[PDB]
Design a protein around this ligand. Structure first.
Ligand code: NA
Ligand code: NA
Ligand code: NA
Ligand code: NA
Lengths: 165, 166, 163, 163, 166, 163, 163, 165, 163, 163, 163, 163
């Protein structure tokens, strides 16, 4: 089985890229489900502010999932996005926190993001030698992904500058 | 230590349970829904490719509805990949990059499961909480409506479905 | 040879029959509404003229809701002009060009039929298809609010309807 | 007892008659369009399904344009279901639930009638009411473009219509 | 020293003349139109008060259309109070603060003048410039359409108008 | 205690008392406005039924502005049903399901008060706070314009009102 | 002397009484809701301040919905400050300028009353009129969801309310 | 003939105000017709910029005409806005310029505006003792009316600051 | 082998040839139009730069309109760069980076050709097909108005073009 | 060498002086506002973060209104970084990254000077130019409301402030 | 001569040559894209007929960006029909009124070139101008994604294409 | 005490330094831009007047993007009037009220320094942080296009500039 790919890319390069984007895909799908999970199980005096702050991120990530996925399909492979595909590519523990304080979740989400950002970064430099278009696509996400973590961190920041985890 | 005013803790917990299953269904649904959105092939591609998105958006909406209902009832909704797989009474959508016909066929089967199990949870909710009962009745029509768009592509002149279900 | 997962083949066809009638009712309704839309005259023309449109569009949409529901049940919806005449249990709107009061009073009667028959079909469904019933309950609410609009133009202080 | 400033009492009624027919034609048309909207099946269902709606709404609006024009001429527009059957010069759409190709091919024929009769009414007006004519010329353009959409689904390389 | 490509200076000047009259008509119209908008009284007030605005906006649009057509033809449009009064072949709308019935009655008369004179300028333009001819045919329908909304308030059951025209 | 920078704790407390009264007037008005919205009947029903909604939304807006202006001055707005009767100097709206002609006339009187008391306050404020004065002046133009809308339905072909 | 086609003047009257109380409830609620919207203070001010508006706008609609339903049924709605106090079965919200927590804990208790009384009417309406039951059921879901928002602010990890 | 007026105003005050607003009305009607007149008869290399710049002013003035008019009606009198009413209240010569340069018209419009602004100003202080609401209504127009003249003047301004009429 | 219901394959063919040339004209025009949109320079840059876009967007539509009309008539539209050059009867716009004046004077002459050829087709179409004539007439009014804008920039007080 | 029709040249200058001082104030504000927009941290971070934007955009608009007013009056507005520093009569905002409570308390003070100086200028314009006075009055109402927003976060259950 | 601040007159002239080629490719593409839009026929007509428009609008956009980027570099974009054939290295699109399956396949090849040449240029630009490189990279993702849309209609249940 | 996951703390600081210098540049620009927005005079006044606004709004957005990036990276953005003056390496815009040609020529220069310094930072970020490099690249494309707009007004028929 084999047949088509993007004009200008070797089947080898194409595969390595798709295999990268597929792990990125399952990352997004796990992320936006987890993001909605927090959306719901948050409590505290600052509930509402954080309840909503999350939606724009959920919708934003859900779109990234779609971009990344169809890009894989463009490369010639098959995007896997069923609950199973998520659990099989997933290399981190499932989100532990449930109905708990805003502080609790934000601290936990921070770490989730350290993972997502760090992994994305890696795949960005690994893509320089493979496909620039795909590296660009990922760089855009990183920006928005990174900024949200700031939103998250800013809630835990010490009057000075230290993270109050 | 709280629930909807007028509801008993017993009924509340029973409703929460029904809904939480409904939640993991929807989650698996709008994940699988986008799964074919990407993996369909054929001449009638663009039409079916685009037809799925609205349904995906809708279902994703229903997930949120149901979960904040579970919460409003007092319990705590579970929406992570792990949870969705625990409550999962069926198996992972299998079809990968296949034809429009193959997918729509497999989809019909998935919806039979969803629709049916949802109507069960409806007459079952008639003793527990009418409000919640109403909620699902709402969704049902839309799920049913969509499964029809799916069956229409499989339907044959007279009225017989061509399900490769084998 | 297929129907909604969960309904008996029999329940299906009985629900499908009710709707198909409700469908021709809606089609006659919106044809009729647009009819008086053009044939109303008098000092308060514009107000009542403008009033009909939103309901026409509303019930005009219910037909598409119902017919499509029928299709989802397995049967085939009939929407041709001949079909709407074969399901008619009342007569063709008689009033041609006339006053606002004239049409409004006639429209009241017509709505009495639609609203009543609809109310009856809602009860039969209570044991057939809840999803299907809830659909009509929704419609009824809007049909009912409109008749009130029609009636308000006919009412008189003591809330006695002067037809 | 009144008409458009500038038209003879006679010219008026002749134009008004033409339109009233064009009106029932439009009403039958959009009832019919919505009909096949629900009764189409096959691999390309969604595309053709979605396609009908915009035209339904379009011709659905032409009727309101024409009827209102008639009213402006002095006469009364007839829009009831009975009226549309009394003006019919063709038969009730026969196809029930069938394939896309089935309905499309039938729809072609129907449009041949509407388009043709409309073309004829446009010429008669050239000597009756220019304003009135220009109205139909507009419609014709849209009816014509749609039939092309219907036909494109039936065409085949050599541009030979396989019915 | 210029005109539409394909048009002769003679025909052009003739068209310009027709249009410039059409222009001062429209101007008087959308000024008089707002004049009743303000001066109507009665139980059916709000309905007629609001019904006029769209027509006013429309006509105001037509003024602009016709004037930039005159300009495109090479001549120069006149749109000042002075000009509108020179080309004016009729008299100033007279009705002040009166009933809805009084105004709508007087309005009908004004429109007879407008509509009629416009249809004249239509068959008259069929030899000069088809484009321009089309333009006015467009407006005509809308003017006619509106005069109908006006007559409908005066119409009586059967079909007779109740014009206090005395 | 705190208040607007540049206002004596007094002027500030005087303004607050003034606006607080206005708040109740507005609240009672937009409640009564809606009351009329439902209970009107007659030939010109729809026209007046709808004419009222905008005003209702406007007055509701004004209440939120006045209240928030109060809180800005350092005091505390009271907008519960009780608070609105404690401040209220006029009596409950009497008219229930009556004729549109009757409601308008009644509403006319209601506005005489609203408008008269407002201008009184617009005066007392010229010495206390201009920002607050300019506020009620804007509300006056709109309240005053609505009364006209109301009086126009009661005007006689000449200028005399008929309650 | 006139009601919804299919209801007995008795069944209709009982429905109208239920709603009318519901109407007064909605009016007290959206005034009281807008009341806390102005008097909340605290570090989490802006979030709650704004959160309440949408709920308020929603209840304002529900009241209009319920009232016009009453009228449709034949009776006459009362929505004046005086009528809110005659139907009111609770006390005038009594919290002035105060912390968010204070107001939410108060609001929580208010919604307890509203939701309970509503739930009752819903069940009591199954034997009276289903259309109206459906209406109140929709109202219940949003009122019930809002209350949750209120509570979510007062919860503490182990789902316990801090009143 | 006499019967109603705004609650809180004497029939005398009401009349003087209405008689003021009526002259303001005819001023607006003359203005927006004249404004459209320029809209059409402008030429030059900077045509398009000025052609459009005018519309927002035309629509804006046309609205003022409506406000002012209905305000008169509110006072109890009858707004006159027919071509005749305009010419009868008009105290200035009809707009002279026709198909001519942008510079030509702008210079002429400037003067037209000096008239309109100056008159409005006058009616604003004459209204202090009559009706504040009506003075407010006129003050708003003046602001927007004055700013447009600046737009107009800015086209004739000398590199330094003198008006190049 | 198929055409608009009511036209002879001959009358239809002649119309298709007229349009097809019109189509190529529109394509050259919107490419050339967008061409000057990039190469204009001068103090009055921004005004003209932007003014051209709308015209461009409009012609792009007209081409699509005309082409699909061709297809409707039965024939096949050619809109490739190669086809524009086969139907083209004039020279490739030849002005590069240059002053606004330069480009407008060039554009003026281009529109002279377009408008003339269009006017001819309009008259030539009265005996062929009125629907298509109407289409081109609408196209004429906007093309004719745009040319005016172009000229208005080149005029000098006494309506004289500065080429 | 020119000014508003009907203004003492000496008056216009006096007015243009007040507005210019008002301009730099606005510019300093809509920079400072964004500054605390980026540097706020804390549990209620998001709420205050987003709350500041609408104000920043408002004041930025005011920057423009006032400036373009100064230009109308005949003089020239200075809106560069240097100019804003030259008109300054207060020190640069000294709070870098800090808590929400910290920044809010600092802004509360900043707004005391802005509002106070604005009312001072409103009182001085009374006999200088009513048009420009109205303009500055509008601004005060909005600037004073925003400061309330800032205070409500610092406000104690009994109307006191923690700085 | 002038160019982007920080670019040698050379790099600047090299980029310009590159983009100018791209400009013609885009122009020929969006002309050909529209060509297909009209000449497609078959069962899935509407689906593909419409699928193309967006891409057409996108490519047209890209052409305007590339051209303007060129002018920004100090050179002069050429976008007339002639200029597009002088730069064009591929031949005119052959397929006329054919099957949708055929056009897609043909279009597939067209994109192989467009996409292949682009990436080539995205490379050569890494040394000349990054802003310009990032530009063509964005266009690549979209051009590349459309090809997929095209190839998806030609895919076999497995992964092999069928021209 | 924290930064982007996967960034050398030393690198993050180096990046945050470049961005801060970029921030003050942006702020100085979106003030200066509005400054020439208010002070431009001349025949083409309106065109350039309105042309500057979209840029002002863009750059203002950039102010924010960069700032919030600096905050993400861990440090704190300085956005007050003082700070913008401290980072400055150019003199304050010295053109008060002058011609369009005057201001445009002055801005052309201002933009040389902005673009040049931006590309310098783009080249320095290559091996510092690709995310932040992409961000500054986007800005360059837009900032460079706007400068072309400025030049096209100063540009001579043969691509030269008059300063
Ligand atoms: Na039930
Ligand atoms: Na003819
Ligand atoms: Na004063
Ligand atoms: Na690189």
């Amino acid at each position: 089985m084999t047949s088509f790919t993007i004009p200008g890319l070797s089947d080898k390069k194409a595969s390595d890229v798709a295999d990268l984007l597929q792990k990125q895909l399952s990352t997004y799908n796990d992320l936006h489900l987890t993001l909605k999970h927090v959306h719901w199980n948050v409590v505290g005096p600052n509930f509402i502010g954080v309840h909503e702050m999350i939606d724009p991120q959920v919708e934003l990530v859900r779109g990234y999932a779609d971009e990344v996925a169809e890009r894989i399909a463009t490369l010639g492979k098959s995007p896997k996005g069923t609950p199973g595909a998520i659990i099989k590519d997933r290399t981190w523990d499932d989100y532990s926190v449930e109905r708990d304080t805003v502080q609790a979740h934000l601290a936990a989400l921070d770490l989730v993001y350290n993972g997502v950002i760090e992994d994305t970064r890696k795949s960005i430099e690994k893509l320089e030698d493979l496909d620039l278009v795909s590296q660009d696509l990922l760089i855009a996400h990183a920006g928005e992904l990174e900024k949200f973590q700031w939103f998250v961190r800013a809630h835990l920041e010490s009057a000075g500058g230290q993270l109050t985890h």
